[PDB]
């Protein structure tokens, strides 16, 4: 047992040379007699002594070995930050869920501490944000800045929208990107940023509208009033918007509420030439609204002029 | 409930 406290003293200081003359078969997994009665590994990984922590492990150290409070090597590791040890016991098969008597995981201890690039590696092997502790807290619940909850949630919906689609899982495909925030919903007239950028008066709301067509926003989303991208653009004659959304599929003849298409909506404004551009678009000018009128019929001579041409 | 063996 003296031998021992020698074994583990070369492990928290990295001595490689005394680490490996005293190891055998028969001391790898030994723990110290006082304090946390941490292994050799579990000093190696909290000390970030690399490469006694890659000798621990090519020699039969047990990372499922326990220190006197349930902590495995993979705590000691994260909760101090050491990257490189963590990918190490990983790679030799930690249990990346591991629970200490408390029942906290070693994401646990590495959101606690703010160690966010561990946090990172932790979650690509499996590390699962939402169990709890013995308190009921989450990793989530202890990440001390917003910066590393909304990171942590990222990271965790990211591998969760790989899983499901690898099962074809439609619905829960469906549901995650739902909660995607470029198709945020203004509460009360339910306009999302693609209305908004189609109606902008600023002279990037062209290149704005493109970008959140690429990034996924639904061309056709209705407002309460029913009118989509095209009706607002179309009754404002913002027409190099207008162009964007054509190119991105926009259905021409979509009905708001009133069911007038954009083209009533330019005819009641009297913009000839965003009439003729929504026309040339495959408009089709025969609709005729609830209230009975066809675009022609609600416009003024020029208008009805261009429907005619 | 303490902390781990190590130093960050």
Same mark, same amino acid.
């Given at each position: 047992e003296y031998k021992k406290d020698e074994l583990l003293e070369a492990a928290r200081s990295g001595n490689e040379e005394k680490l490996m003359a005293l190891l055998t078969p028969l001391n790898v997994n030994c723990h110290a *007699?006082? $304090?946390?009665? *941490?292994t050799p590994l579990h000093l190696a990984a909290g000390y970030n002594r690399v490469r006694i922590v890659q000798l621990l492990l090519q020699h $039969? !150290?047990? &990372?499922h070995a326990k220190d006197k409070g349930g902590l495995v090597p993979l705590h000691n590791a994260c909760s101090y930050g050491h990257y490189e040890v963590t990918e190490l016991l990983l790679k030799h098969g930690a249990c990346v869920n591991a629970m200490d008597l408390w029942q906290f995981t070693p994401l646990h201890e590495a959101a606690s501490k703010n160690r966010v690039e561990v946090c990172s590696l932790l979650l690509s092997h499996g590390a699962d944000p939402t169990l709890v502790n013995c308190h009921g807290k989450s990793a989530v619940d202890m990440a001390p800045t917003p910066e590393l909850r909304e990171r942590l949630t990222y990271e965790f919906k990211g591998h969760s929208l790989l899983q499901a689609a690898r099962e074809a899982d439609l619905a829960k495909v469906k549901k995650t990107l739902a909660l995607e925030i470029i198709n945020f919903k203004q509460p009360q007239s339910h306009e999302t940023a693609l209305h908004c950028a189609v109606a902008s008066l600023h002279p990037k709301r062209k290149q704005v509208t493109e970008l959140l067509l690429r990034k996924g !926003?639904? &061309?056709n989303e209705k407002n309460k009033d029913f009118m989509t991208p095209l009706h607002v653009a179309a009754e404002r004659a913002h027409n190099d918007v207008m162009e964007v959304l054509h190119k991105h599929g926009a259905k021409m003849n979509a009905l708001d %509420?009133? $069911?007038? %298409?954009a083209l009533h909506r330019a005819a009641l404004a009297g913009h000839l030439q965003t009439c003729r551009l929504l026309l040339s678009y495959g408009s089709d000018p025969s609709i005729i609204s609830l209230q009975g009128f066809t675009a022609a019929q609600m416009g003024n001579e020029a208008v009805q002029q261009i429907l005619s041409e | 409930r303490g902390r781990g063996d190590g130093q960050e």
């Open positions: *007699s006082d $304090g946390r009665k *941490s $039969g !150290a047990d &990372v !926003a639904n &061309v %509420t009133l $069911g007038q %298409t | -």
